[PDB]
Ligand SMILES: O=C(O)CSc1nc(Cl)cc(Nc2cccc3c2CCCC3)n1
């Protein structure tokens with residue numbers, strides 16, 4: 618007995634609020650990323666980076682919110698690509714922070730708890746949303762203007778040759794669930810409002826918001842996905858997979874930070890990583 622009642626109408630309102638906020642926070646949506654990847658888009662085709670030549674032709678075109686325009690970019694391709702990826706992570710943090718502030722209840726939480734939830738949550742969300750940009754062959758870069766191949770990334774010298782591999786492995790399975798932006802908006806909100814992050818001051822108000830988000834997600838998935846009766850349970854499983862991906866990421870960043878003692882790690886990512894370990 619699923620029903621239309623005031624409770625369901627409020628859960629649908631929350632779902633729409635989250636969708637509308639997601640569209641305002643994240644310029645490259647899954648809908649847009651799929652249209653690019655499938656060809657279906659009428660926008661110009663992205664530039665493809667599939668080898669060292671196309672990498673150099675392509676970079677003659679890549680751009681960031683904060684341009685870092687001196688000999689601040691390493692000469693070595695692998696380190697430069699990795700530093701570009703760090704800049705993209707920091708841009709994603711900024712977008713995800715803006716999204717989180719639109720989640721009803723979030724800005725009323727203690728500001729330390731807001732920062733804690735973002736600190737321990739953002740990488741789970743980054744890899745969730747990175748799957749939107751990925752297919753079997755590669756990943757959209759430069760906000761959908763470019764595409765870099767999976768095998769090109771695998772070709773970078775140790776220890777830079779597999780930092781995206783676990784995320785491609787997560788994405789091909791996650792993408793098979795065929796979530797849309799309306800589903801993802803709620804899924805991401807649920808992950809951010811996790812009461813079991815370390816050092817939270819007020820756990821109950823976070824759990825109370827999450828329980829409401831979880832009810833919203835379960836209703837959205839039942840309405841939006843008539844083809845599965847398992848999709849809610851499967852997404853709960855994906856949330857625990859994402860924590861493993863983030864642990865494995867931190868470990869790899871330790872190996873890199875101890876092999877490549879010369880290359881600079883972005884200091885805001887360092888603040889996050891130091892406690893994620
Ligand atoms: O963040 C670091 O510590 C660098 S390692 C890293 N690994 C991955 Cl799997 C992704 C990613 N950056 C990113 C974040 C969001 C979007 C995109 C990208 C990297 C390029 C594709 C688009 N950065």
Ligand SMILES: O=C(O)CSc1nc(Cl)cc(Nc2cccc3c2CCCC3)n1
Pocket residue numbers: 666676679680685690697698700701702705757758759760765
């Ligand atoms: O754009 C993404 O989503 C990936 S970031 C990335 N990917 C590639 Cl394949 C190359 C590259 N290059 C680079 C890194 C850091 C700074 C700069 C440059 C190239 C352009 C000049 C500034 N940066």
